[PDB]
Amino acid sequence: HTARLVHTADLDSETRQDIRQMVTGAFAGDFTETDWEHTLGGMHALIWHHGAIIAHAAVIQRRLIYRGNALRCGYVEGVAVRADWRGQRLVSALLDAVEQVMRGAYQLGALSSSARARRLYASRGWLPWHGPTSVLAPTGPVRTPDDDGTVFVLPIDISLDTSAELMCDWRAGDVW
Amino acid sequence: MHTQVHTARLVHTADLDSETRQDIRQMVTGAFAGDFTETDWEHTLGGMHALIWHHGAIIAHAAVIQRRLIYRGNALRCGYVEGVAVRADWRGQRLVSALLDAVEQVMRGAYQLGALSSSARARRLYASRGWLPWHGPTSVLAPTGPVRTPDDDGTVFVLPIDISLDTSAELMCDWRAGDVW
Numbered sequence: 552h553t554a555r556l557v558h559t560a561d562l563d564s565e566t567r568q569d570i571r572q573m574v575t576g577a578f579a580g581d582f583t584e585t586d587w588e589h590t591l592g593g594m595h596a597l598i599w600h601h602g603a604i605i606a607h608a609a610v611i612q613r614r615l616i617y618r619g620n621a622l623r624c625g626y627v628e629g630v631a632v633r634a635d636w637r638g639q640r641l642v643s644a645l646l647d648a649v650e651q652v653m654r655g656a657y658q659l660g661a662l663s664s665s666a667r668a669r670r671l672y673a674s675r676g677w678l679p680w681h682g683p684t685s686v687l688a689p690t691g692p693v694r695t696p697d698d699d700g701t702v703f704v705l706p707i708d709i710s711l712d713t714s715a716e717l718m719c720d721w722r723a724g725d726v727w
Numbered sequence: 728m729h730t731q732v733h734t735a736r737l738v739h740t741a742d743l744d745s746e747t748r749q750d751i752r753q754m755v756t757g758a759f760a761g762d763f764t765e766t767d768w769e770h771t772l773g774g775m776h777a778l779i780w781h782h783g784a785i786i787a788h789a790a791v792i793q794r795r796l797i798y799r800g801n802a803l804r805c806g807y808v809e810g811v812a813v814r815a816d817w818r819g820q821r822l823v824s825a826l827l828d829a830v831e832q833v834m835r836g837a838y839q840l841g842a843l844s845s846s847a848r849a850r851r852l853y854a855s856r857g858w859l860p861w862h863g864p865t866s867v868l869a870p871t872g873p874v875r876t877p878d879d880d881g882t883v884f885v886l887p888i889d890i891s892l893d894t895s896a897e898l899m900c901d902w903r904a905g906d907v908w
């Protein structure tokens with residue numbers, strides 16, 4: 552019913568493995584070792600039932616460049632509810648915890664959604680990015696057309712022109 | 728369990744009550760004698776603050792924030808240490824060692840390396856604990872592309888976590904306003 556927030560460095564090895572395995576199975580294989588690396592470093596929202604982790608979402612810190620400013624961003628990764636626990640709105644409890652972190656620490660939240668999860672985020676006030684997305688790669692700005700149509704943002708202490716360019720910072724694997 | 732007196736406590740920025748957040752900001756700003764800007768304050772936000780309490784006031788602070796440092800084309804997951812400060816009346820009692828015990832525990836548990844910018848005076852402290860001085864040229868991946876940061880050469884220290892870094896190579900931090908390192 553309610554998620555508990557734990558920083559990566561506060562996860563014991565057993566809990567870390569339990570999280571990785573649950574998230575990985577929830578994605579049915581579509582979750583790579585670099586996707587797992589992207590869930591580390593920040594706050595994990597976790598819901599347990601009788602000692603088993605049944606839901607997870609992580610919010611990690613990065614910068615998103617918007618109109619020349621490198622905005623302090625809480626980026627959401629690894630959102631997953633164990634299959635047998637789906638359809639009980641557990642994801643709402645995960646997102647209440649992640650959005651609380653955003654309000655207290657960041658200028659905006661952001662994330663990359665599948666087409667079917669778009670409704671979930673929009674219903675909570677997240678906004679679909681309509682402008683071109685890019686990544687500040689080591690060679691300079693590079694457009695990321697495969698991620699267009701997947702980015703959502705949650706403004707905290709700003710109004711955003713969601714049809715402007717948005718440029719994430721660099722990492723391996725999927726940059727968004 | 729004992730009283731935990733002067734053990735640093737790790738608190739995420741989002742879990743700081745407003746009174747504590749203001750005490751940290753005024754304590755760190757005053758500990759730097761005029762050299763800590765509002766952009767330096769922004770740089771302490773978003774991660775875990777290691778705090779040492781005495782009589783309900785913050786007497787020491789160090790924040791570990793997440794960023795990427797690019798090494799040989801690899802964007803390493805870095806815990807970057809900002810705002811390291813011990814209030815002046817409490818200096819010379821090794822409280823910075825208690826802040827660093829917490830900072831280094833956060834690196835081992837969550838990042839591929841710790842990194843920070845050290846004054847010449849503090850170099851010895853970091854080196855005695857195992858941090859390595861970065862000898863290679865530093866740069867930042869600005870929106871226009873890579874650009875050297877010569878003023879930051881000779882100041883960066885790193886704490887690799889089970890990875891091997893050639894500390895004579897180029898190291899390029901990611902972008903942000905104000906001082907990038």
Ligand SMILES: CC(C)(COP(=O)(O)OP(=O)(O)OC[C@H]1O[C@@H](n2cnc3c(N)ncnc32)[C@H](O)[C@@H]1OP(=O)(O)O)[C@@H](O)C(=O)NCCC(=O)NCCS
Pocket residue numbers: 577578629630631632633634636637638639640641642643663664665668670671
């Ligand atoms: C997306 C996900 C986190 C939603 O979690 P949840 O707690 O089940 O969400 P909800 O209960 O609010 O249901 C969301 C939708 O899931 C679907 N659903 C309902 N019961 C389900 C079940 N028993 N089995 C599978 N899917 C189900 C419905 O389409 C529902 O839509 P609606 O609420 O508008 O009617 C979860 O399906 C999951 O982990 N999916 C795989 C990982 C993934 O895609 N994560 C999101 C990446 S952006």
Ligand SMILES: CC(C)(COP(=O)(O)OP(=O)(O)OC[C@H]1O[C@@H](n2cnc3c(N)ncnc32)[C@H](O)[C@@H]1OP(=O)(O)O)[C@@H](O)C(=O)NCCC(=O)NCCS
Pocket residue numbers: 758759810811812813814815817818819820821822823824844845846849852
């Ligand atoms: C750097 C700092 C955090 C060290 O904290 P600390 O808990 O006082 O550290 P230590 O007790 O290990 O003392 C460090 C050195 O300070 C010196 N010192 C002792 N008392 C001191 C005082 N009252 N004021 C200044 N320096 C003092 C000694 O040279 C000591 O070295 P020693 O133990 O080899 O004799 C603290 O001086 C500080 O807050 N400085 C201002 C902010 C800053 O520069 N931050 C660090 C950025 S790299």
Ligand SMILES: NC[C@H]1O[C@H](O[C@H]2[C@H](O)[C@@H](O[C@H]3O[C@H](CO)[C@@H](O)[C@H](N)[C@H]3O)[C@H](N)C[C@@H]2N)[C@H](O)[C@@H](O)[C@@H]1O
Pocket residue numbers: 578581582583586587627628629630662663664665666667697698700701725727
């Ligand atoms: N794989 C695991 C990851 O999955 C999601 O993120 C990814 C999106 O799903 C991708 O979207 C693509 O796949 C969707 C679903 O098939 C399509 O709808 C969409 N048009 C496609 O572009 C997008 N390109 C990258 C992004 N990292 C989670 O948020 C992320 O935490 C998790 O690590």
Ligand SMILES: NC[C@H]1O[C@H](O[C@H]2[C@H](O)[C@@H](O[C@H]3O[C@H](CO)[C@@H](O)[C@H](N)[C@H]3O)[C@H](N)C[C@@H]2N)[C@H](O)[C@@H](O)[C@@H]1O
Pocket residue numbers: 759762763764767768770808809810811843844845846847878879882906908
């Ligand atoms: N200003 C407030 C900040 O100060 C330190 O970091 C700054 C270093 O002090 C700078 O270094 C310069 O000043 C040192 C001390 O005089 C000299 O030794 C050195 N050779 C100089 O280049 C460096 N260029 C940027 C770095 N952000 C703290 O770590 C940081 O958390 C805090 O926000």
Ligand SMILES: Nc1ncnc2c1ncn2[C@@H]1O[C@H](COP(=O)(O)OP(=O)(O)O)[C@@H](OP(=O)(O)O)[C@H]1O
Pocket residue numbers: 781782816817
């Ligand atoms: N070694 C120290 N360096 C600087 N401040 C100190 C040190 N030891 C004690 N203090 C402070 O000096 C003050 C008096 O110390 P105590 O609280 O330990 O008093 P006590 O001996 O009567 O039990 C306290 O500050 P405060 O009144 O502003 O809260 C205490 O924190």
